[PDB]
């Protein structure tokens, strides 16, 4: 006789094989793939007009809503009603359903394609104990630059066309993570300030190189509401601006590299 044998060519390990697969697909399909739909759903079509009752699949694919209790008051519930309100300055290059859209205006200011920003809260991201998290060093006076590294305050910012476009006046620090996230700079010949995320900055000893945009394009970098703090949406707006540059700053960057 055999340990693990059952009637007529079944054995325990064979059943467990079937069970294991069932468990996997259950978790994958009924749990995980529904969790994946907490953002961006329900989907949008060339006008899903059926305004009186919902299509069945759209209900089945979603999970039951969950509510995050935010740390500084408020709640967010996902998934939810979140349509894109703002007018997008884009035109359909063809009638085909999955044809690309062309920008109609100036895509950096108009904020489309890679220059797009999410409609995040017009709210200042906060530290564990309520203070504004992302602030420049003139405010965060207990933060310093570390012994060894470039202090960029004073150094010029050279844009993609080799033209000095401004002077770095301050660094904005993340007080929650001890991490510099933007440089503030004076745009030469414009009497204004502008943030640039450190990711678009090549920090040298004698200058800061920025290949994302041209010198002239520092003019229209999104302005902040306040001098000494920034909102989650403003961060998106600002970051997006430079990223737009990568595809749009000159005509030839959208075209094929080869």
């Amino acid at each position: 006789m055999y340990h693990g044998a059952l009637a007529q060519h079944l054995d325990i390990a064979q059943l467990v094989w079937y069970a294991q697969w069932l468990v996997i697909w259950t978790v994958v399909l009924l749990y995980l793939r529904r969790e994946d739909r907490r953002e961006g759903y329900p989907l949008v079509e060339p006008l899903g007009l059926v305004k009186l009752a919902p299509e069945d699949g759209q209900v089945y694919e979603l999970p039951y809503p969950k509510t995050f209790v935010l740390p500084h008051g408020g709640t967010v519930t996902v998934p939810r009603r979140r349509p894109e309100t703002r007018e997008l300055k884009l035109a359909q290059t063809d009638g085909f359903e999955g044809a690309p859209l062309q920008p109609t205006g100036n895509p950096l200011v108009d904020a489309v394609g890679p220059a797009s920003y999410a409609e995040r809260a017009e709210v200042v991201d906060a530290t564990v104990d309520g203070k504004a998290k992302i602030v420049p060093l003139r405010v965060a006076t207990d933060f310093s630059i570390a012994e060894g590294d470039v202090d960029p305050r004073g150094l010029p910012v050279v844009a993609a066309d080799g033209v000095e476009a401004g002077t770095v006046t301050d660094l904005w620090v993340d007080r929650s993570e001890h991490y510099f996230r933007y440089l503030e700079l004076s745009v030469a010949g414009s009497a204004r300030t502008a943030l640039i995320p450190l990711g678009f900055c090549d920090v040298k000893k004698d200058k800061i190189v920025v290949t994302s945009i041209l010198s002239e394009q520092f003019a229209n970098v999104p302005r902040l509401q306040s001098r000494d703090q920034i909102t989650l949406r403003e961060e998106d707006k600002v970051s997006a601006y430079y990223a737009g540059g990568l595809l749009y700053a000159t005509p030839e960057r959208a075209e094929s590299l080869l």
Binding site: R82, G98, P100, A118, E177, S256
Partner: protein
């Protein structure tokens, strides 16, 4: 068709070849020139697999195996039934993988994001080349490469290991395994952490970056931080193969004995012999 937030990003441009000609979507999938080459190569490979499989004994997906040639054919073409199908299929796979990678580049440019993903995906393409191309070149036959079958490929890994007596003692393997294990641990820790912060449960409030770092400082005296665990993650994962490659390429061309014996360099220093 479209996610609620998708339409604004779906713009023309960022291709590497062909400009507007292949710059479109089909359902959710971006196409591009490299979507077209990918599908070409997939179709060809899957056809060649189907044809080759029918000429073989069985149709059980576990027991199907398309094997490379005998060693006597060295680096030449082999008759289709006896290793040619394997040779053709290998070319179609490389066509498909490289296409898949370059397609990801195009998709990255359109979104105006980093090329880090296609970059990371070169690592497993490279490792596939180590096993099927570079190591067979150095030993002199395609017949040293691995067969395409669900279970048959394991029989190759098995015997290849035992050609060097105890493959566990291969130092490149030791490195590889250590990265495999630590990478899996770290993914659990990372995924665990994030969820632990956003989902304390019992209606208790969502926590903060500060809490993230405080947790790891408390448990193990150090926290690498938010951005850095992503860099470390990519690094640990990628080193599974980058180091493993050395252990694989060494076995045969640069070492013909058993792998435990290699540790003679240490054990047999005269100073303590």
């Amino acid at each position: 068709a479209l996610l609620s937030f998708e339409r604004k990003y779906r713009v023309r441009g960022g291709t590497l070849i062909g400009g507007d000609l292949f710059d479109f979507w089909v359902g959710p999938y971006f196409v591009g020139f490299f979507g077209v080459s990918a599908i070409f190569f997939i179709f060809l490979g899957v056809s060649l697999i189907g044809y080759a499989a029918s000429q073989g004994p069985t149709w059980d997906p576990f027991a199907i195996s398309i094997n490379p040639p005998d060693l006597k054919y060295g680096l030449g073409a082999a008759p289709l039934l006896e290793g040619g199908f394997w040779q053709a299929i290998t070319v179609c796979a490389l066509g498909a993988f490289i296409s898949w990678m370059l397609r990801e580049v195009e998709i990255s440019r359109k979104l105006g994001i980093g090329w880090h993903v296609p970059l990371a995906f070169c690592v497993p393409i490279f490792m596939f080349c180590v096993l099927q191309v570079f190591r067979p070149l150095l030993l002199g036959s395609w017949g040293h490469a691995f067969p395409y079958g669900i279970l048959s490929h394991l029989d190759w890994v098995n015997n290849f290991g035992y050609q060097y007596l105890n493959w566990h003692y291969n130092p490149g393997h030791m490195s590889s395994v250590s990265f495999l294990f630590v990478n899996a641990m770290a993914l659990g820790l990372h995924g665990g952490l994030i969820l632990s912060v956003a989902n304390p449960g019992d209606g208790d409030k969502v926590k903060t970056a500060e809490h993230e770092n405080q947790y790891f400082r408390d448990v193990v005296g150090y926290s690498i931080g938010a951005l850095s665990i992503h860099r470390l993650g990519l690094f640990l994962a990628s080193n599974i193969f980058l180091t493993g490659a050395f252990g694989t390429i060494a076995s045969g061309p640069f070492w013909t004995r058993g792998w435990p014996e290699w540790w003679g360099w240490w054990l047999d220093i005269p100073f303590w012999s």
